[PDB]
Structure formats: structure tokens, C-alpha cells
Amino acid sequence: EKLDTVLGYLKEFPDYYKYVTKKTYTLNEKIIFEDEKAKSIFFIVEGYAAVELEDNLRKTNYISIFVLPYNVLGIDAFSSYPKHSITVMSESLMLYKIDADFLLNILSIKPDVNDFLLTSIADVFARHYALLGMIAKTPKERIYMALENLAVEMGTEDEERNEIVLPNFINQSVLARYCRTTQPNISNLLTELVEEEFLINKKSPYRIDKDSLD
């Protein structure tokens, strides 16, 4: 609703097509930021990706965090520091590439006043903090926290059945990568979670007992 108003705001300005560009991707494609001189901000309007911890010792990398619809991307490119890569997890994903100077100019002007950008950032921060809570935890503790973080991020409520359901692309292998553990271990932990009535079934898409969750 809110990025829609923003996109609509963007189109009012004569330099819109010059500064705002769309890109669509499919499963397993990598999203890559061109290190042009004039840099841009990226908004995901639909679909999901994963940011991976690059470790060439590992065949499949862990996933550090997911990228959700309405996230801002490429802020990292402004950082004074200098590896992670970004893979599309859903069947498709669409984003907008917006020239950053442009966007940085129309903040003051537009009475959805930058709140939109600050709020988007604020939410990524909050998700970063939630993840930091995983430090020093056992794999079992991590899987609860993961499935909760995802239910908050990306889950869709049944309620009639008193369940929060996760997207299809969150399977055993992906869950393991996000929990930074192995698949055989995730499998065993998923059994425990069903015994403890956290999870309705061991099988994806994961259905999480609404009760058990906040």
C-alpha cells in the first residue's frame, strides 16, 4: 500500500523513467549491484531472495538473511567498508532500481516524508537484531528462533485452523541453511518440534501452531 503511494509519487516527476527502472528475476538467479558511479537503491515489490554467507569450503552456503517484499537493497554499497551474494528463492521476483541522488532529492518534497525510507531501514535493523539473538545458541534453540522469525516475516495465518504457514520455498534444505546446521540434524529437530506441538507437521510448507507462538 505504502510503496505503491511512493511509486505513484515517483511518476509525477518528469525525470521518472530516467531514474527508475524495473528488473524481474527467476528462481536461483543472482541479484548483482553494478558498481556504477551514480549508485541506486533497490525496492523489492514481489518475491523473496536469500543473502548467502560466502564460504568456498562449503558446497551450499548458509543463508544470513532473507530479502522480503518492500525491503530496500543496496544500502551496503554506500558503506565506507568493502562477502555475501543474493539468490532468488521464489519462482519470480520483481524490483525497482532507483537512482539514489533522485530518491535522495524527493524525500523532503514528498509528504510520505522519508518516513517510508527510515521505516524500511528500521525494519531491516529490527530483523538483524533478532538474528543476532542466535549467537551462542544450540541448533535446537536456533530452529525455534528461525521458525519464529520467518513466521513473523513471511508467514501467512490460517486462524480457522490456528496455524501460521510458511512459504513453499522454505524446505528442509533451506531451513538448515538459515539455521546454519546440517540437513540430517534439521530433520531430527523437526521431529522434536512436532512432538512438542510447535510444528503441526514435519513436512513443508511448515505450519506453526499459532498458540505456541507469541
Place this chain on the structure above:
Amino acid sequence: EKLDTVLGYLKEFPDYYKYVTKKTYTLNEKIIFEDEKAKSIFFIVEGYAAVELEDNLRKTNYISIFVLPYNVLGIDAFSSYPKHSITVMSESLMLYKIDADFLLNILSIKPDVNDFLLTSIADVFARHYALLGMIAKTPKERIYMALENLAVEMGTEDEERNEIVLPNFINQSVLARYCRTTQPNISNLLTELVEEEFLINKKSPYRIDKDSLD
């Protein structure tokens, strides 16, 4: 140098004292954001604080991340989500409280064009990612990564002696809290790190062998 130019930019506008306010703190004071209607952004100009993971089961909380000079604070308050607290670690700390609407208006206008705000955010993100690398690691692996993260953040080079030296407030207890482990364990790990020539001495302030580091 750069927040100085910004502060100087701020003073040009007639509404400066109305929107920009200074606050000084001492060791162990808590920095608390008033949840006023009109919200503000906070810039640290000198000193250090720690953000703590609140766990009432624990006598001393772990430290999730440090707050450095030139960090922006209070962006979390814009987030659509809803615990951590913030403690001054150095003898003193000074910050500026800046009304966010004001600040959000003078971005376009000022030819240090918002780059400053984006860059500040970008750097906090980069430090968040570095921390996420601590997930699923042993305490020994964490202490290396911690001492490296801090050397990058807050360390000051000798070079003549080929050492990077950390601030005085990083002692054994603090290191342990940041590594999310116990003190007796940190002590033992510090011995290993001296044997491995990572650390020049087991004693704070920590001096890190320039070689051993990137």
C-alpha cells in the same frame, strides 16, 4: 570531519536550536529515547556505548553491539515492529539529538547530499553482517572474530610496534559479554591467543599483532 561539516550545515538554518539538542552522559548511564510524537535521530560525536541483550535470567547481560562515534541512533524507533538497552562504556559520551522531520528536510538541500546519512546506515549494516558471522561458532572462534571486529571498529594502530590497540574499556568482562561467553572461559581463551601470537598480552588494553590481522 564529515559530521562536522553536517553540524556546521545545520547551524545555517534559522530553526537550528529548535531542532538540534546536545546531551552528555557518563559511565554506566543509560541512553533512553523519549517516545515523543515528533521523533528524532541521534548522532554520537564522542565516546562509546554498548547495546545489551536483555535477559533477566542473566545477572550481566551480553552485549549485542557497540555504538561508536559518528553512528546514527534511534532509527529503530521508526520500525513497524516493537528488547535491548544502551549503556555508556566510556568515561563520557556526547551526542546530538536532531528532530527527524528537520533532518529529513535538509537532505535534498545540502550538497553533502544525504550520502552522509546513507553511509552511516550502510556502515551499521556492514557491522551487523560481521556479527551475524558469529552464529554457530565456538567461543574460540568468536573471540578471534570479536577482537578483529573491534580492531576494525575501535582500534588504534602503533605500527612502530606493529600492534593495534583497543580502548581501555574493553576488559575481560566486557570481552566476555561481547563474545557471549563466561569470564573464566574468556581468560583461558586469551591465554591461547597469546600462545598463538594473535595477542601480545593477556592483559587489557588488548594489543593485537598487526600481522595476524588482515
